[PDB]
Amino acid sequence: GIREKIKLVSSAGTGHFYTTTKNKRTKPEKLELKKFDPVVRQHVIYKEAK
Amino acid sequence: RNGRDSEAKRLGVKRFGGESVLAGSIIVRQRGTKFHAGANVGCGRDHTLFAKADGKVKFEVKGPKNRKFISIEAE
Amino acid sequence: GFEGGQMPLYRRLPKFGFTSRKAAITAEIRLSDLAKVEGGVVDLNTLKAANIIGIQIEFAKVILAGEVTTPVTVRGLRVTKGARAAIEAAGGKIEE
Amino acid sequence: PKIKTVRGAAKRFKKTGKGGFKHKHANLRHILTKKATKRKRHLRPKAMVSKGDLGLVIACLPYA
RNA sequence: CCAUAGGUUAAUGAGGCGAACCGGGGGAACUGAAACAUCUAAGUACCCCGAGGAAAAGAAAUCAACCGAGAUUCCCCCAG
RNA sequence: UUUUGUAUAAUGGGUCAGCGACUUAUAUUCUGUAGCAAGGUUAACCGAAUAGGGGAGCCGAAGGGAAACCGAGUCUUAACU
RNA sequence: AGGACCGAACCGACUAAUGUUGAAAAAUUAGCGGAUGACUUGUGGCUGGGGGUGAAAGGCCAAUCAAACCGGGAGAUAGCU
RNA sequence: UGUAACGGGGCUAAACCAUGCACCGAAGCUGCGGCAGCGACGCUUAUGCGUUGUUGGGUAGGGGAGCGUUCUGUAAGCCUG
RNA sequence: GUUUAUUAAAAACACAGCACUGUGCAAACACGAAAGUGGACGUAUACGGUGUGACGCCUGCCCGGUGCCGGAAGGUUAAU
RNA sequence: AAUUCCUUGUCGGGUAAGUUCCGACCUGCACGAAUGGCGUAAUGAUGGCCAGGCUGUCUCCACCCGAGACUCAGUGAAAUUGAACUCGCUGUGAAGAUGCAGUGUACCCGCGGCAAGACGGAAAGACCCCGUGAACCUUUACUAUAGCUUGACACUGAACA
RNA sequence: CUUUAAUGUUUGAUGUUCUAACGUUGACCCGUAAUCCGGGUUGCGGACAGUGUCUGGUGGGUAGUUUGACUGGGGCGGUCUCCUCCUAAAGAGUAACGGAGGAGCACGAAGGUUGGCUAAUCCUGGUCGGACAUCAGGAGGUUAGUGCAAUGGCAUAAGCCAGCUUGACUGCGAGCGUGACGGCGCGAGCAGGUGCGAAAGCAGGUCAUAGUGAUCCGGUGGUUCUGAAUGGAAGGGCCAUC
């Protein structure tokens, strides 16, 4: 519905991204989640609420 | 104004009492916890009860609420 | 592949891959041959001459697939591990 | 004549060592962020064509 | 005006027919796609021009691949 | 003949006689059978010409992988109980 | 004088009956309309198929017309009989 | 349309109820004779029998085994004025 | 008057008359790959198209929609 | 009203009696002004209604004259047709029986005649439905295209402001 | 460099004028005893018109086609996928244009864990204060709640509140369930790295069951896997994803 799709990109040098959905209207703030990076193999901070 | 129903989900008891199971085997695919998990039985995310060790299926009635457990006897 | 009008199996499944261009010029030599090469020396020619790989073939490989006996000198071909041991065990010589 | 291969079937099935055919799983091209990673991880390896369908496949692929 | 156009005469050749094969100029649709329009049928049917006992093509501004081959045409593979 | 079901008042046939409908070619798969057998077999063509040559090729003896590549293993994966 | 009036030839075809395996694949008999006109007729010519021609009915184009006839594509195709 | 709601005659039992013993009754079962399929089993061994058990309705359809026709070889043979 | 030759002759078609509209002549328009031809050896009192349909009394309001005619400022807008 | 469903509207005229006809009213389902409105003399093998005359149209048919029909001689078809030793009823039955069951009736064979049945004959129902059938027709369905139309380049230049 | 002034020069733009291309279905002459045509002279028009290629617009004038199925005949109406209950005959499944309802999402907390807590309603007392807003006590028992239908669940709470958080992880997966298949579902455990907790442990989303779309074609990021002489590249593959 209204809830958009965003890419959580990795803070390490890799291009690896998780992908998910955000309500852009009610939460306009960016979304930072310490997720797992399998190229670095380490839990790195992910950014970019699209 | 009518004429619709969902597809039948095929719930129920898949392995009955005394029936030998392997580990991992689904015993009761069901909807709430009509049957609860007992010894060597796990309860999945949709309340599917599955054999966590090998053995024989044991339906029992335990506890102060007369719940229907399902154990597995090691066999 | 006509299932009534349902989308057929060869058309509801995705397609994968590509064709190599290079696997059509590689070959795969057993050890049952190379007693057939007339010489006790094995190159791409000496195999082509023995009607065993084909003219278009550029690459060849000497897979363990049974029973080399005579001492054979393999030249310029890739040899697998097990068949390096089998060629060198029955006399033999592998240079590249 | 000589039998023509159903050509878009050759791009989708590949013959194996004992005559069965492997194929890539469906459902893993797009709409993907809605799917669990357990689905997607179980759809990546290639799979054998089942018993029902080998008749169709062998009919479409007579040289492979 | 010179001259060209035109006119007259003579010499040589052509014209038309013919079954298929051949080269070229044009060129469908039914059909198949379980509908249909891209696609197919198919450069097929047909129409037209021209030629020969055959025609056409043909003597690398061609391939190949760091080795080489050596014009064109036809057949069997390559290879569904 | 078609049908759930035809004495059916459902179809067809006035009768006789003659003709009248699962073929042919080329590929592929399985069964039988024959030859040879980790090998089998040639096509075009040459031709004393159904012989004999011709093994170009095709199929099989090795798979895995999208592919490089590896190879009785291989792919997945940083690595696999 | 008159797309004037009555009415034969001439052109037509309103009604009825017969006929309907007819005398006739459209007629006969009894009445009927026009009958100097936008008439009728002979002989020749011209227009052609998505085309002609049409005082228009989808009429007519050789007893064929919401697309002639012949030949070909062609054994079109027919999940239907 | 005609009795026309026992098939009919006809029945006061030839109706109904209860009990019992007879008999009729099918391509069922049995008897006798025959053929064929599938098993098992001692030989026969390349199969037949002293056997022996059991099976044999059949549409779509699958499997197996045959007869006839015309033509070629056997056949310049063998029948035939 | 004409029409469904062969089940419909009619209120239908036609018609004189009316109106609208196009057309300045190498006319519009039509047949025609084109040449050309008809329009017409005519010239706007003519010709083509469309509707209505002798005559008499008349033909009212609506330009928002669709079309046509006219305008060129601005927006958008192809090949290049 | 060629227009009006309700509707045989209501009133009037004609008729013994008038769903039609004529006149009128107007509540015009759903007239109406050049897809013309309303009148309209004459005309019409035009539509509707009334009357005089006339009559076999009819009450209700009768007789007669001819041509067939019928008999004889000659010639000599056709559609149809599984086979026939081809009755009625009542019932059964693929549900409307010459063929089944029960029963009743009926010597065998023709000729003239009638047409109730043989789901009679003729024509692979024209209606209805279906077919991923066809054809023509329409349109602001889709896709094209002829035609008309727009600009660029070509054919296609100079001399001055 | 910025900004300006004069000249020369280099090119485009526009308007007037011109004759020389082209048009002439104007006149005259000739081929020619010819209203065709061609040539000549001249007049008029004249870079226009016209035609070719390209291009926008218009285009039933014409052509090719499409215009669903279910359906107690077809049309008209309704429906078409997914979830819940009943029908459904005490395993599963089970039809009808049978009876009833819902979905085409929401959520970065409404997920994970740790620690804690327990509802509805009614009665009584009490400032504004009321049938019903807060307080206190009692009865009561989950008649409540569960992000949204219904069913099954839920107190060990799956309900309610707070602290810290990202396991809403990545690669796999014994074994099962469920479908004709495509597919869908459940899953202990293994490896890597993480959160909460003192720890045992729990966490691969949410109490569960709806919240959806195959393939092709193509877009974006990563990975030399390929890369038609060779080195690259383009394109393709693979992984993620739209």
Side-chain angles (χ1 to χ4, degrees), chain A, chain B residues 2-75, chain C, chain D:
Chain A
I2 293 160
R3 192 170 179 93
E4 289 189 346
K5 286 173 264 177
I6 65 172
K7 284 179 267 332
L8 298 167
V9 303
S10 181
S11 172
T14 63
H16 182 266
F17 57 90
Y18 287 157
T19 178
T20 174
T21 58
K22 199 180 67 173
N23 192 1
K24 170 200 148 69
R25 182 189 59 256
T26 62
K27 294 295 215 296
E29 294 80 12
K30 299 294 181 180
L31 182 67
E32 293 185 0
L33 277 159
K34 198 162 289 145
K35 300 294 268 176
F36 183 78
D37 193 0
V39 181
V40 181
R41 282 172 71 208
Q42 194 67 47
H43 276 83
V44 181
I45 310 156
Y46 285 17
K47 285 175 191 168
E48 187 76 18
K50 294 289 289 151
Chain B
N2 310 312
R4 48 201 185 273
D5 199 67
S6 64
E7 173 218 37
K9 305 292 179 177
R10 301 163 176 85
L11 296 176
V13 178
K14 303 294 166 60
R15 299 292 178 208
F16 291 94
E19 194 159 352
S20 177
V21 293
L22 284 167
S25 294
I26 296 173
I27 299 153
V28 182
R29 177 176 292 282
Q30 60 183 2
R31 222 112 33 87
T33 52
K34 177 167 191 238
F35 291 95
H36 290 268
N40 296 314
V41 169
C43 184
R45 65 168 294 275
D46 62 345
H47 314 289
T48 293
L49 290 180
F50 65 96
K52 199 182 268 194
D54 299 340
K56 283 195 180 196
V57 185
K58 173 72 175 140
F59 287 89
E60 294 166 347
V61 179
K62 290 305 180 206
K65 300 175 168 205
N66 291 307
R67 300 289 175 70
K68 300 164 207 172
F69 291 174
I70 298 173
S71 172
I72 279 171
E73 293 167 327
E75 189 66 31
Chain C
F2 187 74
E3 301 199 345
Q6 181 177 11
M7 193 51 58
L9 182 75
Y10 66 96
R11 193 171 139 69
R12 71 169 85 116
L13 292 172
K15 53 194 202 176
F16 61 97
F18 66 96
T19 289
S20 188
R21 294 280 295 176
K22 186 181 282 184
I25 63 171
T26 56
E28 169 176 298
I29 284 102
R30 305 192 56 265
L31 296 181
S32 294
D33 56 354
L34 67 74
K36 298 185 178 61
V37 294
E38 190 193 18
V41 53
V42 178
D43 198 75
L44 296 163
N45 46 12
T46 326
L47 291 175
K48 294 179 188 175
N51 201 12
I52 218 163
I53 56 173
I55 288 165
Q56 291 291 103
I57 297 302
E58 286 180 4
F59 302 134
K61 198 166 174 179
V62 194
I63 287 90
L64 163 71
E67 294 145 344
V68 57
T69 298
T70 182
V72 177
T73 303
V74 176
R75 188 186 302 279
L77 270 68
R78 307 155 150 201
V79 179
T80 66
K81 180 201 149 156
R84 184 189 296 274
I87 287 165
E88 290 176 355
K93 178 72 166 58
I94 295 163
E95 62 177 358
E96 61 202 358
Chain D
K2 195 202 274 220
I3 298 199
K4 279 179 138 153
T5 295
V6 168
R7 166 70 54 157
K11 306 173 179 183
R12 292 178 176 89
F13 305 101
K14 192 159 194 297
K15 193 80 172 291
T16 60
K18 282 156 67 140
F21 287 95
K22 74 174 173 199
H23 74 90
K24 187 193 215 204
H25 282 288
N27 285 305
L28 180 81
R29 291 287 196 190
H30 58 87
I31 339 135
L32 286 169
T33 190
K34 81 167 53 172
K35 295 180 172 62
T37 318
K38 184 168 150 202
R39 289 186 62 188
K40 294 182 279 188
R41 184 177 68 237
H42 284 85
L43 289 170
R44 285 202 291 285
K46 262 69 184 317
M48 301 299 285
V49 173
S50 66
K51 183 191 71 63
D53 296 333
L54 285 176
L56 303 167
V57 174
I58 286 166
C60 294
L61 291 175
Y63 292 97

